[PDB]
Design a protein around this ligand. Sequence first.
Ligand SMILES: CC(C)C1=CC2=CC[C@@H]3[C@](C)(CCC[C@@]3(C)C(=O)N[C@@H](Cc3c[nH]c4ccccc34)C(=O)O)[C@H]2CC1
Length: 452
Amino acid sequence: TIKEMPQPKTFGELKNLPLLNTDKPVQALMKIADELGEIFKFEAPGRVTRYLSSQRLIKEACDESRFDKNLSQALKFVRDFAGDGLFTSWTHEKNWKKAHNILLPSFSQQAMKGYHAMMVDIAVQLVQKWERLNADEHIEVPEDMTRLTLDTIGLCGFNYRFNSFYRDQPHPFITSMVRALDEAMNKLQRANPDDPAYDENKRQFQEDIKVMNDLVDKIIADRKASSDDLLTHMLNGKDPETGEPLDDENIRYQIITFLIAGHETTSGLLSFALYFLVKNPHVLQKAAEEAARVLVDPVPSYKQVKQLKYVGMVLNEALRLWPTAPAFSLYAKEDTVLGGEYPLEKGDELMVLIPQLHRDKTIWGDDVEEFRPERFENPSAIPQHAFKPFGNGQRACIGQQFALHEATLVLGMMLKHFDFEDHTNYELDIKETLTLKPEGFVVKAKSKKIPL
Ligand SMILES: CC(C)C1=CC2=CC[C@@H]3[C@](C)(CCC[C@@]3(C)C(=O)N[C@@H](Cc3c[nH]c4ccccc34)C(=O)O)[C@H]2CC1
């Protein structure tokens, strides 16, 4: 009944801004939501946003007639290099619907069947790497998952080989992208971004943007000198509405977007999935049993991957507890009241805190912190807008099918070929680069000695 909104602790003139002066801002906002509940106001000089954590309010926020996708401050900083690519465009910019129409067919069932062989090429490189480890050598999990996911989007999307399994260090692309993301996350807490103490930060940022754009003009130059892949559709496809193709500036932004959006979160998903599987041995056993039963050939087929149902549920349960793109932003299209209590003005910003949404006890029950893939047996038994790891509506993840096909294929092959040991009894440490990923997660993989 027009309730007053809670607000976390303030720092005078800086309002709530210093609460983001941490290497783990999403984990900080989750603790605030635990303390303040389903909604709280966050204020900095010149800006306000309302953090939502309950399925009760988020099911309203997901009404596309009332709320559209907002560029959060984080996405405004990413737009410095991702421009009006699909992830960092407003819905009302011409290039959003145009690129959407042109690129959606690059995620058709026909398209996924076409990507499968190249996903297998990279997955086989991962399995061969682990088969070739010596006694008592370990696996650096997020490092190897990032090698796989970057190489997969490079090859499937652009017929480009990053060759990440030939490198003991990350590809220059990854090093520059991680630093750009870390700069973008860093600028969020930065009062007085014009301070000369940040002139080197700016210089380094521009440098990192130059590294990713050099690789893009090279992917483009490569293709020019001679495929039916994502890059084919970017260069040739026409929007059925206008009959127009994408312009060169936009195409560059889409390549940068798909290299970032198309691997970082999938590497996080695979890393968290393997973390929960080694921490939950009964779940690991059930998934390994399915992989053994289904993947009866040396090379997995598209159809077999579609039959790894329990592996698919493991991936959804990992996205429930640690959604690797952990927030999305909305703005009110008009004046509206939220849950009958919180009046909003046109333009008012909302932040969906996805990990908190996924811990709503009124949806999942009291065992909400438990890793239980069986929660996903029946999508009709899950309330509306309870599970939002790929965002909402027409602005939902275009790459969800690609990511889940790749992750199901790879996790299936991992569970078929190896037994895993949590040999250090790893303590979860979640590194934030806007996206979430376990840091320092290592395992030992004992070969089942099954040939490829
Ligand atoms: C690539 C995808 C997965 C991402 C989604 C994100 C959504 C919200 C972000 C993000 C998690 C990074 C950390 C801050 C946070 C939680 C945020 O709300 N920030 C708000 C509010 C804010 C924080 N600091 C600010 C400084 C100035 C202005 C606004 C802000 C914002 O960025 O808009 C960020 C990471 C990148």
